Amino acid sequence: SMNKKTKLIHGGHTTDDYTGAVTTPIYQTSTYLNPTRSSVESVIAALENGKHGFAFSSGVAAISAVVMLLDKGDHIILNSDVYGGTYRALTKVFTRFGIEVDFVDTTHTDSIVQAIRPTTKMLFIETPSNPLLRVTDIKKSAEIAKEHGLISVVDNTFMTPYYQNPLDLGIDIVLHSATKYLGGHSDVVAGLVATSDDKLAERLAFISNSTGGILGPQDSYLLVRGIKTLGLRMEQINRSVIEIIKMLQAHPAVQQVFHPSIESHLNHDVHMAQADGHTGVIAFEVKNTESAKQLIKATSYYTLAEALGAVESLISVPALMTHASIPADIRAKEGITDGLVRISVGIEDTEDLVDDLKQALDTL
């Protein structure tokens, strides 16, 4: 009944019953004879149509807690292009604890069915993924997980709860790196987890309380605050994304463009069926690493950084920053060419962002 933008302002419990304060008090305290974190947990639960919310000290900490739902010998399926925090955690930490990991191209859901082993207990899916924005069918993944008794998990960071709600599609657990869009201001490191399953929430509550990766009260407050403008920020970002893609597809100096809004993008129709907007992450190819380096230097409004989901627009070259550790020829196979540029669209004026990127591409 509440339209989305209204729910962001009035959903969850973010006021103080004791005094009537319209914002949640910051409970910088360790002993009662934490309500600020509880407030942010109720916000993420409401936004994702879940029953239970959990706030961790980082997105990495959220993923670590969810993975610890498993035991030694259990097996997890993940989409084949997981990298960064999540890939390194699973393969360099949790495999030392007997957790077995298999990477599977989930863009075809029957790949999931083939990879299911007797010891499989979890299916973990990012959609869209980083950096090429591969799309996985959430609803079909949920059905497969239910039929085989797997805990289903979606990393919903890139879409945010404003545009995609995996719990409504039958997923067990939805999680976020709230460091990105949710906080939205490049000033809180946090992770968020929501579920509707009472037994899974109890196990999460136990894991959290026993490994202690909790989000502090000041960060909880800044996170609730940033979420208030989530809808306004993603809608501005979405307007710029559409215009930017039109420009990129027309520009001579640009080759392939990667974004789920493009009709020829693999599983474009799947993305439109499970989401009503788009992420602000876009990847596209210029000629080579030298053109990529020239493009970055020629923009006025794009800031060179690896982050995403800021109010400012960000630009990076995956092959030189996030993926420079993979050998070159393997980068080629996976599509991370030397001319691949990734942008995170911010909330600057749309025309300013279109024209700035275009005049910079014109110097190529």
Q: Is 199 in the site for a copy of itself (CB under 8 A)?
A: no
* Contact assessment for residue 242 and residue 265, using Cβ atoms and an 8 Å cutoff: no
Could you say which residues in the range 10-39 bind a copy of itself, by CB under 8 A?
A: 10, 15-23, 25-33, 35
Distance CA 364, CA 355 (A): 15
Q: What angle is formed at CA 66 by the lines to CA 64 and CA 68, rounded to 5 degrees?
A: 70
Cβ 118 to a copy of itself shortest distance, Å = 19
Q: Is 119 in the site for a copy of itself (CB under 8 A)?
A: no
Residue type, 156: N
The only residue of 108, 140, 228, 251 in contact with a copy of itself, by rule CB under 8 A: 228
C-beta neighbour count of 253 within 10 angstroms: 19
Q: Is 186 in the site for a copy of itself (CB under 8 A)?
A: yes
Could you say which residues in the range 40-59 bind a copy of itself, by CB under 8 A?
A: 56-59
C-beta neighbour count of 359 within 10 angstroms: 12
Q: Is the torsion defined by CA of 295, 296, 302, 308 positive or negative?
A: positive
Q: Which is nearer to a copy of itself, 169 or 341 (CB)?
A: 341
Distance CA 307, CA 27 (A): 29
Cβ 252 to a copy of itself shortest distance, Å = 26
Q: Which is nearer to a copy of itself, 103 or 301 (CB)?
A: 301
Q: Which is nearer to a copy of itself, 110 or 212 (CB)?
A: 212
Cβ 337 to a copy of itself shortest distance, Å = 25
Q: What angle is formed at CA 169 by the lines to CA 166 and CA 171, rounded to 5 degrees?
A: 60
The only residue of 45, 47, 144, 189 in contact with a copy of itself, by rule CB under 8 A: 189
Pairing of strands 120-126, 100-104: unpaired
Could you say which residues in the range 85-114 bind a copy of itself, by CB under 8 A?
A: 85, 88-89, 92-93, 96-99
Cβ 50 to a copy of itself shortest distance, Å = 22
Could you say which residues in the range 276-335 bind a copy of itself, by CB under 8 A?
A: 301, 303-305, 307, 310-312
Could you say which residues in the range 61-80 bind a copy of itself, by CB under 8 A?
A: 61-62, 64, 68, 71-72
Beta bridge partners of 285: 340
Distance CA 108, CA 291 (A): 34
